[PDB]
Paper text:
In order to visualise the structure of KLC1-TPR domain without this unnatural ligand bound, we created a new fragment of KLC1 that differs in its N-terminal His-tag linker sequence. Due to difficulties in crystallization, this fragment lacks the non-TPR region and the TPR6 motif. The structure of KLC1-TPR[A1-B5] is composed of 10 α-helices (namely A1 to B5 helices) adopting the common KLC-TPR structural motif. However, in the crystal, the KLC1-TPR[A1-B5] molecule makes a tight interaction with one of its symmetrical counterparts. Through a 2-fold axis, both C-terminal helices (αB5) bind into the N-terminal part of the groove of the related molecule, covering a total buried surface area of 3196 Å2. The N-terminal part of the TPR domain consisting of A1, A2, B2 and A3 helices makes extensive hydrophilic and hydrophobic interactions with the B5’ helix (K405’-F416’), as well as with the last two extreme C-terminus residues (G417’-S418’) from the symmetrical molecule (hereafter denoted by an apostrophe). The phenylalanine residue, Phe416’, located at the end of αB5’, is fully buried within a hydrophobic pocket formed at the interface of αA2 and αA3 (αA2/αA3 pocket) and composed of residues Asn259, Ala262, Leu263, Arg266 from αA2, Ala274 and Leu278 from αB2, Asn302, Val305 and Leu306 from αA3. Specially, the side-chain of Phe416’ occupies the same hydrophobic αA2/αA3 pocket as the Trp207 from SKIP-WD motif. The TPR domain closure of KLC1-TPR[A1-B5] is certainly the consequence of the tight crystal contact that drives the C-terminus of the B5’ helix to lie into the groove with Phe416’ occupying the αA2/αA3 pocket. In KLC1-TPR[A1-B5] structure (this study, “IN” αA1), no hydrophobic pocket is found at the αA1/αA2 interface and residues Pro210 and Leu213 from the αA1, as well as Ile209, occupy this space.
Kinesin1 functions as a hetero-tetramer composed of a dimer of kinesin heavy chains (KHC) bound to two kinesin light chains (KLC). KLC is also composed of three regions: a N-terminal Heptad Repeat (HR) region that binds to the KHC stalk, a TPR (Tetratrico Peptide Repeat) domain involved in cargo recruitment, and a variable C-terminal region. The TPR domain of KLC1/2 belongs to the 42PR motif family and consists of six TPR motifs (TPR1-6) with a non-TPR region of 40 residues inserted between TPR5 and TPR6 motifs. The N-terminal capping A1 helix exhibits structural plasticity adopting two distinct and defined orientations relative to the rest of the TPR domain.
Numbering used by the authors: 209 to 418
């Protein structure tokens, strides 16, 4: 991300995190206006700026306002960076999240799957950004009740995370809790209780010393 933009990012998110949207929002909109003046609309820095203001709106739960901006950012990024660029998968995942926040889980799912395929096609089927996207897809299938698909995506992500980061990785514990719940939802008690035992024991192990 360009340097003068992330400084603005830090400043605006600081304001947002104090609930001071009356300052965060004008700063983003003016910065967007001034960016457009310098480089015209179809420029990566404009998409980046739109993503910052979409985050601020999301932080206020203005979900449809945020999607409008990211839909604009997505078209910019596809034209300027390409249909398979990682930033396009980033913008697709955020749109999947915003549609899901409006109960529009059937619109969300293609967007999230595309972001997954983009990340596999760039980072390889084993990258942990793929696991992260898998966790995001799993959560969306859960809100549609597709528990066999949830369990598949969580297993894939647990395997990426645990074979590629530590067994003591925050995400490994996070993905194990998610999958454990999903087993219990399905009635697969002995699979659910196998995972729960691991979580407890490893937690006890972490606090205890050598």
């Amino acid at each position: 991300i360009p340097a003068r933009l992330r400084t603005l990012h830090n400043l605006v998110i600081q304001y947002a995190s104090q609930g001071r949207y009356e300052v965060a929002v004008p700063l983003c909109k003016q910065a967007l206006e001034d960016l457009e003046k310098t480089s015209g609309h179809d420029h990566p820095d404009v998409a980046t700026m739109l993503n910052i203001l979409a985050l601020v709106y999301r932080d206020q739960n203005k979900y449809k306002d945020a999607a409008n901006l990211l839909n604009d950012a997505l078209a910019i990024r596809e034209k300027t960076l390409g249909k398979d660029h990682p930033a396009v998968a980033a913008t697709l995942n955020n749109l999947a999240v915003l549609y899901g926040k409006r109960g529009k889980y059937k619109e969300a799912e293609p967007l999230c799957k595309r972001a997954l395929e983009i990340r596999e096609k760039v980072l390889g089927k084993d990258h942990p950004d793929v696991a992260k996207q898998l966790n995001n897809l799993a959560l969306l299938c859960q809100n549609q009740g597709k528990y066999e698909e949830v369990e598949y995506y969580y297993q894939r992500a647990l395997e990426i995370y645990q074979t590629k980061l530590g067994p003591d990785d925050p995400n490994v514990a996070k993905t194990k809790n998610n999958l454990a719940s999903c087993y219990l939802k399905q009635g697969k008690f002995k699979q659910a209780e196998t995972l729960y035992k691991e979580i407890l024991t490893r937690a006890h192990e972490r606090e205890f010393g050598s």
